[PDB]
Design a protein around this ligand. Structure first.
Ligand SMILES: [Ca+2]
Length: 440
């Protein structure tokens, strides 16, 4: 294979940038702060469930919505004893409240029968509900986006939407049901990998890792978009042996390409790297939330990793910020270890790019605690605020199924300062568990 260079007109998480992170991450400005285990509580309304990846009901710009006096948070939850038991529950608090004890449980968004009543071929094969986002429409509706996962069809993941009908009173919120419940996107082969392409490889025992999940709603100039975790397709730089010879994925220089590519080809990570073709994808939606246009990815991570999760994007003080989470254990970069887990971040003058790295390398947050640590956090997510230079970082705390008495729960939130192309964790900015806004 001859060296070549092709960007496919999109941005890229390069080997050179990633290689800088091990030295850089020793700086406290890029570190998830240490939390105090004796302040940590289970979500009391969730009655012995693990509650992990969660997201707020947001306005179109990403700020936290006020639904008839309440904040709403959707979260994956299930039986700690059953790793494949995952559904979306809806929690809520009166605006102004901050304690984890303020979060009431409206129960599951969906009935088991809803996927059948939807008259949706893909939905009737669903076995779990994985993460997404939720927006509060201009006509006052709760518009959910989430990932339909099918264990019966080799882990197919499909971007899916529903309207959640919720009655509000002075005292409680109550889910009456859903409507407009439909598959929107399951990949197209050319831009984003579909499940058949995963099956073509030999599915799980191939080492490939197919993703199409964590859809995030955002608008710009009245146009509606989802930005999501995916993998590339055949026309925007696919996985394969040929991919290791594309200098676009290396960055820096040809000297660096030669050196780094010959090390990678000689390493035990060659096959992993060939399979790695993560992407943060984008589609425009119609006004009824169906698919308008498949768009080019904002960024891809060919060779580095197959798994860039919890896609997030918003405009803040004149610039666009794009984030994703990723485990060091699934990466191929020298010096990044199986303990390292990241939130990576990118910046642009436009929603559709081009995106360049925050803090020169992409590093925004690093968390390297032992999986057994009660204060281990995952699924970090930057929640934009109405004003100022801070966003709020939410995450879940405590690994699923690890401890009988300590379940996955809302992590203490904290502040991340953002200005220009730089971020820093705000010193001693730890808030309540699950707190969504600075303003009370
Ligand atoms: Ca792949």
């Amino acid at each position: 294979q001859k060296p070549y260079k092709e960007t496919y007109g999109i941005s890229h998480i390069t080997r050179h940038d990633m290689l800088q992170i091990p030295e850089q991450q020793k700086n406290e400005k890029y570190q998830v702060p240490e939390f105090d285990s004796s302040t940590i509580k289970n979500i009391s309304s969730a009655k012995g469930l693990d509650v992990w990846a969660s997201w707020p009901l947001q306005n179109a710009d990403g700020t936290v919505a006020n639904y008839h006096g309440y904040h709403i948070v959707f979260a994956l939850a299930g039986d700690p004893k059953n790793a494949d038991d995952t559904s979306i529950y809806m929690f809520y608090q009166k605006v102004g409240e901050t304690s984890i004890d303020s979060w009431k449980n409206a129960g599951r968004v969906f009935k088991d029968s809803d996927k059948f009543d939807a008259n949706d071929s893909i939905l009737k094969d669903q076995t779990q509900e994985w993460s997404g986002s939720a927006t509060f429409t201009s006509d006052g509706k709760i518009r959910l986006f989430y990932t339909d996962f099918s264990g019966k069809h080799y882990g197919k993941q499909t971007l899916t939407t529903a309207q959640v009908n919720v009655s509000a009173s002075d005292s409680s919120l109550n889910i009456n049901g859903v409507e407009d419940y439909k598959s929107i996107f399951d990949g197209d082969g050319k831009t984003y990998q579909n499940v058949q392409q995963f099956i073509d490889e030999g599915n799980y025992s191939s080492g490939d890792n197919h993703t199409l999940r964590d859809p995030h709603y955002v608008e710009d100039k009245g146009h509606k978009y989802l930005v999501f975790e995916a993998n590339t397709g055949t026309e925007d730089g696919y996985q394969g042996e040929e991919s290791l010879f594309n200098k676009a994925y290396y960055g820096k220089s040809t000297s660096f390409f030669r050196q780094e590519s010959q090390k990678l080809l000689q390493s035990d990570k060659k096959r992993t790297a060939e399979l790695a073709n993560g992407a943060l994808g984008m589609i425009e939606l119609n006004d009824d939330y169906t698919l308008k246009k498949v768009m080019k990815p904002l960024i891809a991570s060919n060779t580095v990793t197959d798994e860039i999760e919890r896609a997030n994007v918003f405009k803040m003080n004149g610039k666009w910020y794009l984030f994703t989470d990723s485990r060091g254990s699934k990466m191929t970069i020298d010096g990044i270890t199986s303990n390292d887990i990241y939130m990576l971040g990118y910046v642009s003058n436009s929603l559709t790019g081009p995106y360049k790295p925050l803090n020169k390398t992409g590093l925004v947050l690093k968390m390297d605690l032992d999986p057994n640590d009660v204060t281990f956090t995952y699924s970090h997510f930057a929640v934009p605020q109405a004003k100022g230079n801070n966003v709020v970082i939410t995450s879940y705390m405590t690994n699923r199924g690890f401890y009988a008495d300590k379940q996955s729960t809302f992590a203490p939130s904290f502040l991340l300062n953002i200005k220009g192309k730089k971020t820093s964790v705000v010193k001693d900015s730890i808030l309540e568990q699950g707190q969504l806004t600075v303003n009370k």
